[PDB]
Every structure is written in C-alpha cells, then in structure tokens.
Amino acid sequence: TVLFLKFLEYFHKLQVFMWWILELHIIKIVSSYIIWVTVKEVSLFNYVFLISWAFALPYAKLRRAASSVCTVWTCVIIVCKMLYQLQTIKPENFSVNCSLPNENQTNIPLHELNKSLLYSAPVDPTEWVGLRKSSPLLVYLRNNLLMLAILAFEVTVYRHQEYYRGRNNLTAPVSKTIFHDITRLHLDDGLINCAKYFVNYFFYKFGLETCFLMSVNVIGQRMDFYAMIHACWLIGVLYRRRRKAIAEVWPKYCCFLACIITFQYFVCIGIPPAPCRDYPWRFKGAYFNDNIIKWLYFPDFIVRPNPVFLVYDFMLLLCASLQRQIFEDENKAAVRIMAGDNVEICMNLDAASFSQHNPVPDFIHCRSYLDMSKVIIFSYLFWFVLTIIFITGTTRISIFCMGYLVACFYFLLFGGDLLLKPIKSILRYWDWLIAYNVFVITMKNILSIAGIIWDSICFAFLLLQRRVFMSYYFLHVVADIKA
Amino acid sequence: FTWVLFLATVDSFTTWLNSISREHIDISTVLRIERCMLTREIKKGNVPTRESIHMYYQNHLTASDLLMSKMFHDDELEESEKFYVDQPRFLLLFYAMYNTLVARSEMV
Numbered sequence: 001t002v003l004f005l006k007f008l009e010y011f012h013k014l015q016v017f018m019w020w021i022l023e024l025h026i027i028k029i030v031s032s033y034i035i036w037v038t039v040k041e042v043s044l045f046n047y048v049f050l051i052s053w054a055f056a057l058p059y060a061k062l063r064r065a066a067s068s069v070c071t072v073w074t075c076v077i078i079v080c081k082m083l084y085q086l087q088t089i090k091p092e093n094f095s096v097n098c099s100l101p102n103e104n105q106t107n108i109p110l111h112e113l114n115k116s117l118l119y120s121a122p123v124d125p126t127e128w129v130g131l132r133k134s135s136p137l138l139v140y141l142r143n144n145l146l147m148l149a150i151l152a153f154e155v156t157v158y159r160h161q162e163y164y165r166g167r168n169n170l171t172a173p174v175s176k177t178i179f180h181d182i183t184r185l186h187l188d189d190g191l192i193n194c195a196k197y198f199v200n201y202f203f204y205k206f207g208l209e210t211c212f213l214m215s216v217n218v219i220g221q222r223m224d225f226y227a228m229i230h231a232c233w234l235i236g237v238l239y240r241r242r243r244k245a246i247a248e249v250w251p252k253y254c255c256f257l258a259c260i261i262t263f264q265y266f267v268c269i270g271i272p273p274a275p276c277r278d279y280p281w282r283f284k285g286a287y288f289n290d291n292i293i294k295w296l297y298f299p300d301f302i303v304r305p306n307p308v309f310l311v312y313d314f315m316l317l318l319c320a321s322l323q324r325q326i327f328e329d330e331n332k333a334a335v336r337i338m339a340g341d342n343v344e345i346c347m348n349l350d351a352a353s354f355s356q357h358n359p360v361p362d363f364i365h366c367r368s369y370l371d372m373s374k375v376i377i378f379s380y381l382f383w384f385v386l387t388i389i390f391i392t393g394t395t396r397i398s399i400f401c402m403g404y405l406v407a408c409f410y411f412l413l414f415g416g417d418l419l420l421k422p423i424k425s426i427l428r429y430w431d432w433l434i435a436y437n438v439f440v441i442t443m444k445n446i447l448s449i450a451g452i453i454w455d456s457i458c459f460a461f462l463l464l465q466r467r468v469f470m471s472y473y474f475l476h477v478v479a480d481i482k483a
Numbered sequence: 484f485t486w487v488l489f490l491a492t493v494d495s496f497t498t499w500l501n502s503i504s505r506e507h508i509d510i511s512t513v514l515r516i517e518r519c520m521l522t523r524e525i526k527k528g529n530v531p532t533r534e535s536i537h538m539y540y541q542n543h544l545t546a547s548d549l550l551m552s553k554m555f556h557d558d559e560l561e562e563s564e565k566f567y568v569d570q571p572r573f574l575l576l577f578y579a580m581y582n583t584l585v586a587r588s589e590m591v
C-alpha cells in the first residue's frame with residue numbers, strides 16, 4: 001500500500017547481507033555441526049567424518065574434496081540404516097551372549113556387580129558399527145539428513161554468490177569483511193568506527209590471544225591426561241616468546257591437534273565387543289581401578305570415556321586453523337595497508353625523543369569521546385589486573401596462592417617507577433608472572449589424582465596487559481608519566 | 484514533575500563538592516596545563532628543563548591561582564576543557580566525587 005516499496009528494499013538488503021555473511025562464515029557452521037553429529041552417536045561410520053573435518057580445517061586445500069566425501073558417506077549411511085529396519089534382519093540369529101568370567105582368570109575386581117557391557121545384554125556385531133534398529137526412523141536419521149542438507153546448502157551458497165557475481169557484474173571482494181570501507185585509518189575517529197573496525201578485524205589482531213585462552217579452557221574443563229598433554233604443548237609453544245618465533249611451529253601444533261583428536265576418537269570408539277576379550281587393565285592381576293581408569297582416557301566398558309570432551313579439542317583446532325590462515329596472509333601488503341602491520345615493536349624505545357615518530361595520535365587530553373575509554377584502558381587497567389591477581393590468590397586457599405600475593409605486592413609497590421624504564425624489564429617480569437600462572441594451571445591439573453576458573457581469567461587479563469605493553473598507544477602514557 | 488528539582492539538587496551537590504576542595508582542583512588544573520606545555524616542548528624541543536615554566540612566566544612566583552594570568556592557550560587544551568564541561572549529568576557528579584577522593588585520600 002504505502003510502505004511496501006521501502007519494506008521490499010530493506011528486505012533485499014537483508015537477503016543480500018545474509019547471503020554475504022553465509023558465504024563468509026559457512027565452513028565453521030558445517031564443520032561444527034559435523035563434529036557435533038560425530039560426538040552424538042559415537043560408533044563407526046562416523047570416524048571418517050572426523051578424519052575428514054579434522055585434517056581439512058588446518059589444510060584448506062582439502063576442503064573441496066573433504067565436503068563431497070562426507071556428502072557421499074552420509075547418504076551411504078542413510079541407505080544402510082534404512083536397510084537395517086526390514087523384518088527379515090532378525091538380530092536374534094546375529095546376537096552373541098558373552099560367557100561370564102570366573103574369579104581366577106580375567107576377573108573384574110568388582111565381581112558382585114558385573115553389570116556393565118558384555119555382561120548385562122547380548123552384544124550385537126552391528127551396534128559397534130552404527131546400525132541400532134530404531135522404530136521411528138525419523139528421529140534416528142535426522143542427524144544425517146540435516147548434515148546432508150548443510151553439505152548441499154554450502155555449495156548452494158557458493159554457486160549463488162557465483163551467479164550474483166556473473167549478473168550485476170562485480171568482483172570477489174579481496175577485503176573479506178562486513179564494512180568494506182572501515183579500515184585502520186578510520187579506527188581512531190569515532191566510537192562507532194572503532195566498533196566497526198573490531199567487528200571487521202577482531203580475530204586478525206587477537207588470534208593468538210584467543211587460541212591460548214581456548215587451550216586453557218580445554219585444560220580447565222577437560223582436566224585429565226590429555227589436558228596434561230595440551231598443557232605440555234602450550235608451555236612448549238609459549239616458551240618461544242616473540243610472535244614471529246611461534247609462527248614457525250604453528251603448523252606443527254595444528255598437526256598435533258588433528259592427530260590427537262583422531263587418537264581420542266579412536267580411543268572412544270572402544271574395541272569390538274563381539275569377541276568377548278577384555279582390556280588388559282581389567283584382569284586378575286591388575287592395579288588400575290575406576291578413578292584412575294577414568295582419569296586416563298583409556299577405552300573401557302564399565303565406564304565410558306565421555307565423548308563430548310572432543311568439542312573442546314574441536315574448538316581449539318578450529319581456532320588454531322584460523323590463526324594459521326591469519327599468520328599466512330598477514331604478511332601481504334595489500335591487507336597490511338588496511339588493518340594490518342601486526343608485527344611487534346622494538347623493546348629498547350622510550351617516550352622521550354620518539355613522540356614525534358609514532359603514527360598513533362595523542363589521546364591523553366581526551367578531545368573526542370572514545371579517548372576517555374583509551375586512557376582508561378591503557379593507563380588505569382594495570383592496577384585493575386593487579387587487583388585481579390590479588391583476588392585470585394585469596395579465593396581458592398591452596399599452596400600456590402603465595403606466588404600470586406608476592407607478585408601482586410611487588411608490582412603494587414614497584415609499579416609506578418617501572419613504567420619509566422624501557423619495556424624490557426617490565427616485560428621480563430610480566431613474562432615470569434605468565435610462566436608462574438601457567439605452571440600453577442599445569443600443577444593443579446596434575447594433582448587432580450581445585451577447579452581453575454579464576455586462574456584462567458587472571459591469565460586472560462595478563463595476556464591483555466602484555467599485548468597492551470607492546471602497543472604504540474602506551475608511549476604517550478609513558479611521556480605523560482615522564483612529564 | 485520532580486526531575487527539575489532532582490537535577491537542581493544534583494547540580495548543587497556537584498557545585499558543593501567542587502567548592503569545598505577548590506585548592507586541589509586548581510593545583511591539578513595548573514599542573515595539567517604545565518604538563519601539556521612540557522610534553523609539547525619535549526615533542527618539539529630537546530630538554531625538559533623543569534624550570535622552563537619559570538623562565539616562561541618570567542617573560543610575561545608564589546601564586547596559588549595562576550589562572551587569571553593565562554600564559555599558555557594551545558587550542559586542543561580548550562577543546563578538551565570544552566569537552567569536559569559539556570559532559571552530561573550524572574557524570575560530572577562522578578568527576579566531583581573522584582576529585583573529592585583524590586583531595587581527601589588521608590581521610591579516606
């Protein structure tokens with residue numbers, strides 16, 4: 001009637017924006033849903049999905065074939081699962097009863113309650129493969145139908161964007177972002193411009209600072225042997241202090257993540273239960289009990305290794321692959337000129353005789369409106385993270401709280417004068433504190449045989465402040481402190 | 484209905500808190516002006532020369548209020564001052580409370 005023209009214009013804007021954002025963020029959705037389906041039903045015929053989308057994220061060149069492979073395997077699985085529902089399948093002729101053991105050989109230390117797998121129901125040679133013979137056949141197949149739908153909608157979005165490039169002649173925007181005009185130069189103009197810049201290039205600037213936090217999340221929420229392995233690799237990669245020093249080992253870290261998620265799924269798949277053989281850690285002479293066999297991520301029947309623990313490793317792998325891509329493309333000048341130049345700065349500089357060289361403009365006197373935020377985040381945050389270090393050393397009363405209090409007291413006493421020095425010494429002390437924090441995390445993980453939440457937040461704030469110390473915006477505050 | 488008297492009361496409150504501690508506010512203001520002068524100089528010149536303010540006012544000592552003798556008027560300073568004075572309500576209250584805190588830290 002009156003508003004249909006403008007309404008349809010807004011609707012076309014919304015449609016093209018949805019198509020653009022889906023073209024930009026499709027791989028994460030499809031891979032996440034595939035991993036979630038793999039975790040839901042743990043049996044075989046889903047192991048290949050995990051191989052594909054665990055060796056396809058870090059190596060993008062395989063992302064083309066690793067999609068069609070899953071597209072074929074999901075329909076093969078659907079056909080098989082439907083074929084397994086006929087009345088002439090008769091699992092009775094298929095089932096196997098595993099004979100009880102005796103007290104002497106291959107005994108379970110809990111003999112009065114053998115209520116576990118292999119003993120509480122006749123095993124099926126196909127249950128270990130995936131066929132389960134469910135009645136509705138719709139709730140049983142939706143996790144594969146939706147996966148096929150996503151795999152098809154991926155290439156649908158691809159070819160729709162291709163056809164939109166054909167008609168209305170345009171080009172593929174090299175500036176893969178949402179606001180194509182907002183760039184580094186437009187950052188320090190207005191608060192809205194800064195918000196747009198961060199919506200554009202958040203992960204570009206804060207990749208490692210987020211991958212490390214994701215690994216710490218994996219460690220803190222998993223809390224087992226593989227968490228100790230992740231801590232070992234985290235300490236090994238952080239030991240290389242410089243940024244460009246870890247851009248060499250990142251592919252190795254991604255390969256490690258892929259191999260470990262593969263091994264963890266191959267552990268969680270168990271052993272074929274049709275042969276009634278059991279695991280070596282459940283015999284007559286054995287020392288492993290339920291708690292230690294749950295801590296160690298070993299295959300078992302009475303206790304099942306929780307498969308949902310793999311979503312954290314998957315998140316870590318996805319972030320690591322994205323960060324690898326960032327490391328790969330951050331050296332190109334075409335993107336370095338627009339929201340680029342992510343290389344660290346020298347550490348022997350000083351605010352004196354240099355305030356006329358840095359490209360960043362002054363903000364201490366707060367001409368604009370966001371300059372108050374800049375001065376509150378670049379100067380009045382050090383004391384906030386010191387307060388956080390104090391808090392995380394009086395909440396969970398343990399032996400490791402001494403280092404937190406000592407570092408807090410030292411920095412709160414000798415803080416004001418340290419900012420006069422070149423950033424070398426303060427960075428050395430902050431690195432020692434990072435090392436103590438990650439060491440406390442690793443030790444609290446090892447001694448589980450607690451519940452680190454404040455230590456992760458402390459680690460995040462310390463990483464934020466460390467990233468702050470190596471910024472050009474800090475030299476203005478150092479000049480003001482000299483004044 | 485009552486927002487007018489509410490705003491009048493809060494404005495009188497900020498005026499009170501600024502008045503009872505005017506000495507520290509003026510000292511901080513003149514120190515900020517000297518800091519801006521010195522950082523501009525050190526960005527352009529070579530040496531801080533703590534007595535630069537002395538040899539500067541000597542052209543055109545003990546006076547707690549140097550504000551009537553405006554000797555340094557670089558434009559961005561007045562821009563910042565205007566930005567601070569046009570701040571909305573319930574925020575100048577925060578500025579006054581912070582000034583009271585920094586003024587009476589011993590009592591705090």
Ligand SMILES: *[C@@H]1O[C@H](CO)[C@@H](O)[C@H](O)[C@H]1NC(C)=O
Nearest residue numbers: 092093094095096097121122
């Ligand atoms: C296996 O055990 C079940 C019940 O314990 C019984 O119904 C069946 O006849 C046994 N033999 C099989 C399934 O081969």
Ligand SMILES: *[C@@H]1O[C@H](CO)[C@@H](O)[C@H](O)[C@H]1NC(C)=O
Nearest residue numbers: 101102103104105107111284
């Ligand atoms: C186990 O082995 C010993 C020696 O062979 C025997 O005395 C005993 O009867 C066997 N059975 C059990 C239940 O231990």
